[PDB]
């Protein structure tokens, strides 16, 4: 199972 | 970072003349990921060589397996040829039944 999306890039 | 590739040429199973096998060239520990790998049959590039999906290790260095199905004979000689930004020239490694 893949990690759900995240925003807050670098 | 820049890391020189490590190169290993070998068959999937113990070599048997007349018996269908798989010719492998495993390249590991290199960075960046851009790399060229060819398998040579008597000096000539074998055509339809497949390779694993790009991956990498704990240290972040990449590894790739290039493979083609082949039938060894006593007189045919194979090798692996690799090109990478860290190499001043193509690195050729001959297949040896004992390594």
């Amino acid at each position: 199972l893949y990690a759900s999306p995240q925003l807050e890039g670098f | 970072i820049q890391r020189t590739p490590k190169i290993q040429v070998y068959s999937r199973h113990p070599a048997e003349n007349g018996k269908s096998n798989f010719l492998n060239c495993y390249v590991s520990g290199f960075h960046p990921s851009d790399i060229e790998v060819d398998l040579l049959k008597n000096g000539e590039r074998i055509e339809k060589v497949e390779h694993s999906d790009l991956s990498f290790s704990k240290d972040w260095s990449f590894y790739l397996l290039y493979y083609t199905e082949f039938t060894p004979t006593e007189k045919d000689e194979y090798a692996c040829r690799v090109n990478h930004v860290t190499l001043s020239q193509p690195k050729i490694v001959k297949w040896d039944r004992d390594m």
Binding site: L1, Y2, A3, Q6 | Q2, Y26, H31, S55, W60
Partner: protein, 274 residues
């Protein structure tokens, strides 16, 4: 024994030739089971092991969506890195991510990962306690501050202790026959004369799984470390691995040396003598 699920993603910018290529792969222990290639025509997460093909439409839609979103994220992250370091847009750059979890024999959480690398070097990594980050340099420290403010560590913590463990448990069952097996190494020894006075003894380990193994040499009982040649453990292509260790022995002294093999497929370590 203990198992692991890993995801490795690699983004490579290509200035002048469009968007960076994004390639991602999934692993349970040493078995790959999925891949995503941004350049591919499918534009879908693809199966790379038999035991994953049984998953239904929902799984393949959700995984695809999640990895494609990671694709765009790294895409923007490469541009940000460029800005931070103020690097030329003519240079190609790399961004790697690894994440996943470790479980025990009972299938309960044991360890979690969530870390990045820029151009081959560490950038930012989630610490063991899954609450703090380690920022490699001052560019990463800017990301670390932002992630602390956005409670990013809390989001990944939950995934690594929840979803990651569950997906791994689900895979270890569906792939029971494949992933829960150990192939003991086939071991033998080869002899190779260099000159009249010396000779190479080579110790082989073939067709083993998982890939973790340890090959050691001993003479009279002592450990021959700084004289033993070792190669990287290597895949055979069929799902098993290979490796060898070699020592240069004085001719007539081959019987002083023993080869030692440690693999979890072996109840006890082995001892090979020429």
């Amino acid at each position: 024994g203990s198992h692991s699920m890993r995801y490795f993603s690699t983004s490579v910018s290509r200035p002048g030739r469009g968007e960076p290529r994004f390639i991602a792969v999934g692993y349970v222990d040493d078995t790959q089971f999925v891949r995503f290639d941004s350049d591919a025509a499918s534009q879908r997460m693809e199966p790379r092991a038999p035991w994953i093909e049984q998953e239904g439409p929902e799984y393949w839609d959700e995984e695809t969506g999640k990895v494609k979103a990671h694709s765009q994220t790294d895409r923007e992250n490469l541009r940000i890195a460029l800005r931070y370091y103020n690097q030329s847009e003519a240079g190609s750059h790399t961004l790697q991510m690894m994440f996943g979890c470790d479980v025990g024999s009972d299938g309960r959480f044991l360890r979690g990962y969530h870390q990045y690398a820029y151009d081959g070097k560490d950038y930012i990594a989630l610490k063991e306690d899954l609450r703090s980050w380690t920022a490699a340099d001052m560019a990463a420290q800017i990301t670390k501050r932002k992630w602390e403010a956005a409670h990013v560590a809390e989001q990944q913590r939950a995934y690594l202790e929840g979803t990651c463990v569950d997906g791994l448990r689900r895979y270890l069952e569906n792939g029971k026959e494949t992933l829960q097996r150990t192939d003991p190494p086939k071991t033998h020894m080869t002899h190779h004369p260099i000159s009249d006075h010396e000779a190479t003894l080579r110790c082989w380990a073939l067709g083993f799984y998982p890939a973790e193994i340890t090959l050691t040499w001993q003479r009279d009982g002592e450990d021959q470390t700084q004289d033993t040649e070792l190669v990287e453990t290597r895949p055979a292509g069929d799902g098993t691995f290979q490796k060898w260790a070699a020592v240069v022995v004085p001719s007539g002294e081959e019987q002083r040396y023993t080869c030692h093999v440690q693999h979890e497929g072996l109840p006890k370590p082995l001892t090979l003598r020429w």
